[PDB]
Every structure is written in C-alpha cells, then in structure tokens.
C-alpha cells in the first residue's frame, strides 16, 4: 500500500485512543522513558494522556483494511479530538 496515499480517516478513533492510552500507560508503568515533562504525575494513565495531548506517544497504529493491506499512522499524525 502506498504510504503517500492513505485512505483511512485522519482522525484517531475512540478505540485507537483507548488502546493507545492503555498501552502507553502500561509501558510507562514498566519503566519506559517518558516523552513529556512531568510536574508531579505518578499515575501512568495521567502521563499517557499528557503524552497524547503533547502528541509525543511513540506508537504506530497499523490499521488493517478489509482487503488485507494496512496503513501505518503515527499517533502524532492523527487528529486527537477527545
């Protein structure tokens, strides 16, 4: 599939947001480096949401198409609504 033309939505779905936040929160809880600055946050979920708001989550969403191909979107490339 041509990465120059990705047909899927440029928005992050609610399910993508949910799973990305959960995954990154688990990664933080397992002592992964944090990409944003931290005032006093110790809850991995809060840190993951701060990273998502900052657009600094190092995860790629591989969206599968019904035909079998896939499209890779960086979390910073998608439009975060909520």
């Amino acid at each position: 599939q041509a990465n120059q033309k990705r047909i899927t939505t440029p928005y992050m779905t609610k399910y993508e947001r949910a799973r990305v936040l959960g995954t990154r929160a688990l990664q933080i809880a397992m002592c992964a480096p944090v990409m944003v600055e931290l005032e006093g946050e110790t809850d991995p979920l809060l840190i993951a949401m701060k990273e998502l708001k900052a657009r600094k989550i190092p995860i790629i969403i591989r969206r599968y198409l019904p035909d079998g191909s896939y499209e890779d979107w960086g979390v910073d490339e998608l439009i975060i609504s909520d």
Binding site: T23, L26, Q27, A29, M30, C31, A32, P33, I60
Partner: protein
C-alpha cells in the same frame, strides 16, 4: 561446511531498555543470545555478521515485553552426508578417533579406520599405525574424512567419519 545465510529471530526486551541507545542494545542482545548456539536445522551458528533490518516492535498483550523480529546475516557451519572435510585428531582410543571439525566433534570408529591400521596404546603418544609405521595417525594430526553420519543431541551436532575410499587419512 561453513555457510553464510540470513536468519530470523525475535527478542523480548525487558522494559528497562527503552530510550536512546536502544537499537545498539538490541543488536548486543542478539549477539549474546544466538552466537555460540547450535541448531539441528542450520547446524552450528558461528557468528552474526550483520543485521539487515530491525522489525517494528509489537506490543504483546499484558506483560508489555515488546517484541522485535530481527533479520540478520550470519555464519553457520553445517556438514552434510558424504562430505570430505579436513579434521584434527584430538584424542585417540581403541574404539577409534575422536576428531574435531571446528566446533564439531566427529567420531571415526575402529571399523571406519582402514584395516591396515592397528591401535598402539604403547606408543609414547597412543596412536594408530601400520606394522611398518609408514602411516601413523596420532593426536594433533590433520586428516581428511567423509562424514558418513550426522546426529543432533541437545541442539549440538556431532558427526561420524570414515576413511574408506581413496585420498583420505593423514595429510
């Protein structure tokens, strides 16, 4: 026989290693694990020459250990049946010769040593020799042998040698 081939491997990283310098840790982890190992499929794994590509991390469900496929070219040593190879005689016994082909141990039984050769434990080095002593096989000698058998044991291959046909034996 020494091959250079491409291989696939998956590594599970403890989470402590995420950050800068991570890929170098990935390569060093591959070097640690696969080098020195031996597989019945690919024979012994001599060393990892080069890493072609690092596959994208995939997050496993739970347990968060990220999983990296690695494509890499490496040197392996895998004999085959009927192959003639240079070997070194490390120890001798009445049963036969235990020789080494690089990493591999290879055995030549007394029946596989030709009939002209008799075992002499009495020699200062125990050795094999003809009554005339014309051809004497003792430790450290270089020999040529056919691999007439290969056997895998706990991922480690050891072979069976034979000196029957022409152009074999002492070099």
């Amino acid at each position: 026989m020494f091959y250079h081939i491409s291989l696939e491997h998956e590594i599970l990283l403890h989470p402590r290693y995420f950050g800068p310098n991570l890929l170098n840790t990935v390569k060093q982890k591959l070097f640690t694990e696969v080098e020195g190992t031996c597989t019945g499929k690919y024979g012994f794994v001599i060393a990892v020459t080069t890493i072609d590509n690092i596959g994208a991390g995939v997050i496993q469900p739970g347990r968060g250990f990220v999983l990296y496929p690695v494509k890499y070219k490496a040197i392996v040593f895998r004999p085959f049946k009927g192959e003639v190879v240079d070997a070194v005689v490390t120890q001798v016994n009445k049963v036969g010769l235990f020789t080494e082909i690089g990493p591999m141990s290879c055995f030549i039984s007394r029946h596989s040593i030709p009939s002209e050769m008799e075992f002499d434990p009495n020699s200062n080095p125990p050795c094999y020799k003809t009554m005339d002593e014309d051809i004497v096989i003792q430790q450290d000698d270089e020999i040529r042998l056919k691999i007439v058998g290969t056997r895998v044991d706990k991922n480690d291959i050891f072979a069976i040698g034979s000196l029957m046909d022409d152009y074999l034996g002492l070099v």
